[PDB]
Each structure stands twice: as C-alpha cells, then as structure tokens.
Amino acid sequence: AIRKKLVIVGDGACGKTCLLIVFSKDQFPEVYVPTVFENYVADIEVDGKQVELALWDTAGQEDYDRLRPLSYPDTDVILMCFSIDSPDSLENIPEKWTPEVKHFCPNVPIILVGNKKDLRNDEHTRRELAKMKQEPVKPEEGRDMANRIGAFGYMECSAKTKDGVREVFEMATRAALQA
Amino acid sequence: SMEMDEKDFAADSWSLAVDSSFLQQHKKEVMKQQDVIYELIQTELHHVRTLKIMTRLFRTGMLEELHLEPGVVQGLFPCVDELSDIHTRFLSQLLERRRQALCPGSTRNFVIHRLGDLLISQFSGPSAEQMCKTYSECSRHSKALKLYKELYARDKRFQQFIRKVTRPAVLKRHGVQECILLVTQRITKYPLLISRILQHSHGIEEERQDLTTALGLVKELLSNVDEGIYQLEK
Numbered sequence: 067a068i069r070k071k072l073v074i075v076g077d078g079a080c081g082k083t084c085l086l087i088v089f090s091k092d093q094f095p096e097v098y099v100p101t102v103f104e105n106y107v108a109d110i111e112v113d114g115k116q117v118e119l120a121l122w123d124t125a126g127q128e129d130y131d132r133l134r135p136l137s138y139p140d141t142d143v144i145l146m147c148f149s150i151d152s153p154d155s156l157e158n159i160p161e162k163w164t165p166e167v168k169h170f171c172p173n174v175p176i177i178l179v180g181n182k183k184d185l186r187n188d189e190h191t192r193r194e195l196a197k198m199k200q201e202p203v204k205p206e207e208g209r210d211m212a213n214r215i216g217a218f219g220y221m222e223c224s225a226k227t228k229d230g231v232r233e234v235f236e237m238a239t240r241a242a243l244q245a
Numbered sequence: 246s247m248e249m250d251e252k253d254f255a256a257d258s259w260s261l262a263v264d265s266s267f268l269q270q271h272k273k274e275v276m277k278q279q280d281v282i283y284e285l286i287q288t289e290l291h292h293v294r295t296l297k298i299m300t301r302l303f304r305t306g307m308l309e310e311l312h313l314e315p316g317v318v319q320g321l322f323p324c325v326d327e328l329s330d331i332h333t334r335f336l337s338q339l340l341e342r343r344r345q346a347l348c349p350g351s352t353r354n355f356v357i358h359r360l361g362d363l364l365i366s367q368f369s370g371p372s373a374e375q376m377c378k379t380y381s382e383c384s385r386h387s388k389a390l391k392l393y394k395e396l397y398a399r400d401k402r403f404q405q406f407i408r409k410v411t412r413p414a415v416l417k418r419h420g421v422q423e424c425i426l427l428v429t430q431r432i433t434k435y436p437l438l439i440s441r442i443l444q445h446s447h448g449i450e451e452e453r454q455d456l457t458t459a460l461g462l463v464k465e466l467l468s469n470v471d472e473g474i475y476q477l478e479k
C-alpha cells in the first residue's frame with residue numbers, strides 16, 4: 067500500500083464536504099449529515115494497485131488566505147470542485163482557485179469535478195436560476211473549463227444519489243500514481 | 246480518551262445517542278439543534294484525543310525512547326502542551342454542561358438549551374488571547390513537516406519508532422503530519438458548527454443572540470490568527 071494525499075478545493079456551496087462524507091461512509095447518511103469532515107484514510111484498489119488515500123477538506127478556510135495554504139504540503143491529487151446548480155462557482159475556478167493551486171502544488175494533477183449533477187434536471191433549481199438570467203452548468207461548459215485550466219480530467223457526480231462518486235475517487239488515485 | 250466519554254459519543258448523532266422514547270418527546274427543531282451541538286462536542290473530543298496522541302505518544306515517546314538533539318522534538322510539535330491545556334479545559338466545560346443536563350436515572354438522555362454563553366466565554370477575554378497567540382505560533386507548521394520528513398528519511402531509529410507507534414489500526418488517520426493538519430484545520434471548523442447550531446436556535450431569543458455574538462467572536466479570532474501567520478524556514 068502506497069500513501070497518497072488528496073485535497074478538495076472550491077467555493078463554500080460547491081458541496082465538497084458532502085462528497086467526502088458520502089465517499090468515506092460509502093452511504094448517504096440517512097439520519098444526520100455532519101457539518102464538518104475531519105480527515106480519512108481510504109483503502110482503495112485501482113487497476114490492480116493498492117493505495118492508502120488520505121482525504122482532506124478545505125471547508126471553512128476559503129476566507130483565510132494564510133491558513134488555507136497549510137492544507138497543500140505533499141498533495142498528490144487536487145479535486146477542484148464546483149456545483150452544477152451554481153454557474154458563479156465555476157466562473158471562480160480560473161481566476162481564483164487555479165492560480166493558487168498551481169503555485170502551492172506545481173505539477174500536481176487537478177481533476178475538475180462538477181458536483182450536484184442531479185440538480186441539472188431539478189424543477190426548483192431551473193426556476194430559481196432563471197430568476198437571475200442563468201441556467202445549470204452544461205456538460206460541455208465543464209469540459210471546456212477543464213481544458214482552459216489544464217485539468218488532468220473533467221468528471222461529474224451527485225453525492226445525494228451516490229452516482230459517479232466511486233469513479234471520481236478511483237480516477238483521483240490513478241492521477242496520484244502518475245509520475 | 247476515557248471509555249466513559251467514548252461511549253457517550255459513539256453514536257453518529259444525538260437522535261441515536263439518546264433513548265428512542267426520550268427522542269419521541271421532542272419537537273423536530275430541538276432534535277436538529279441537538280444533533281449539531283452533539284457534533285460540536287464529539288469533534289472537540291476527537292481534537293483533544295489528537296493533541297493527546299501528539300504529547301503522550303509522539304512527543305513523550307521520542308523523549309523517552311530516542312536520543313534526538315535538544316530542540317528537535319520541540320520543532321516537531323510546537324505549542325502542543327499549550328494547545329492541549331486550552332482545548333482540554335474547553336472540552337471539560339462542554340462535557341460538564343451535558344452532564345448537568347442529564348435526566349435523573351439516565352446517563353444518555355439530555356438537552357443542552359444554553360450553549361452560547363459557554364462559547365462567548367471561550368472566544369473572549371484571556372482565553373481568546375491565549376488561543377490567538379498559540380495558534381499564530383501554524384507559523385511553525387511547515388518547518389515541523391520538513392523536520393519530520395528529514396528525520397524519517399535519514400534516521401533508522403526514528404523510522405522504527407514511527408512505524409512502531411503508528412502500527413495500530415486506531416492511528417490510521419492519526420500520523421505525525423495528519424495530527425499537525427488536523428490541529429491547524431480545527432479553528433476553521435468552529436464558524437461552520439456555530440452557524441448551523443444558530444440556524445436551529447431561534448426558539449429562545451437570548452440563545453439566538455448569544456450564538457450570534459459567539460460567532461462574531463470566533464471570526465474575529467480567526468481573522469487575528471490569519472493576520473499573524475508567517476511561515477518559518479530552517
């Protein structure tokens with residue numbers, strides 16, 4: 067087993083904490099969804115290789131520019147998160163998150179992850195977004211953004227329905243393994 | 246950690262920790278408030294358990310089993326004694342508040358109605374000054390990590406000691422570097438927990454105001470810690 071380190075970055079409403087919890091529990095919490103995530107060491111086996119993946123969150127650190135970079139040392143893979151029901155969180159990816167991740171984590175692979183994909187076909191979501199001259203982030207828009215920022219790849223998931231969650235973490239393990 | 250507190254906080258939520266016939270007696274909004282309060286104490290117990298691994302298992306183990314140069318162990322675990330005193334006292338007050346709230350004849354059924362006052366005390370006055378000063382001193386976080394990395398890759402006895410004390414499954418996510426980041430990230434969890442407790446504390450207006458003040462206090466502390474940080478290099 068090789069030890070690798072994954073850090074999840076992105077805006078407050080991107081749903082990065084829910085993604086970590088649903089993955090670490092391997093279930094959608096049926097009684098209480100916790101407010102915070104501490105850390106977790108996942109035993110993952112991808113493409114025949116056994117890896118110990120330490121999972122870290124940056125939630126609560128978005129306003130503290132000197133505290134936040136202390137999460138970056140020895141990172142092997144970055145999960146750059148944005149919410150599909152929030153086009154403004156995607157707009158902040160190349161001008162706020164990408165320059166910071168490339169300064170503190172040079173040559174580290176970044177996977178651009180579109181969270182809350184179930185909300186792409188939500189009645190309340192499409193209506194609420196239309197009241198601001200907006201619509202849910204389309205799959206081609208996420209792919210375009212990942213190209214623009216030089217991401218290793220672009221993926222989508224839904225922590226609520228657990229769809230796409232396992233695949234994001236297996237891919238992240240594969241990205242951490244490359245040299 | 247002591248078995249007493251580990252059992253009282255073994256459940257995933259307050260609604261699962263209390264007896265179901267006690268849960269049935271409360272309104273939904275109370276259950277939601279209590280679940281976040283339980284998470285605050287539960288994660289505070291884990292944070293204090295982390296600082297105990299750093300002082301008793303890592304730091305003291307290196308002083309008694311290794312011949313490290315003077316100042317090496319201090320550089321690996323800066324302010325851990327001060328941090329352990331600050332948070333063990335805060336945990337003691339949270340656990341005492343829970344205990345006074347227990348129903349007679351019960352060791353699990355309780356409701357914490359007044360938390361904001363305890364949070365205002367913690368994040369104000371001398372106790373706030375000592376947390377700001379101790380967390381600003383984060384500036385030594387990177388140097389501690391480099392020192393650990395240098396020793397693991399150059400010292401046989403240090404590597405054997407590390408491999409030995411971190412071998413139990415209970416320390417899987419609690420190694421030297423994991424401990425250091427878990428401590429740095431703790432302070433930025435407080436606003437998240439307090440805002441969700443406040444979200445469900447509008448029932449009593451004094452409690453909503455106490456929590457609003459307590460939230461403002463944590464954010465002032467975090468802003469002060471953030472401004473006082475500058476990475477040190479060896």
Ligand SMILES: O=C(O)C1(Nc2ccccc2)CC1
Pocket residue numbers: 112113114115239240243244
């Ligand atoms: O080498 C392997 O076993 C892994 N898969 C992999 C897949 C595609 C290209 C390169 C490598 C990293 C997990």
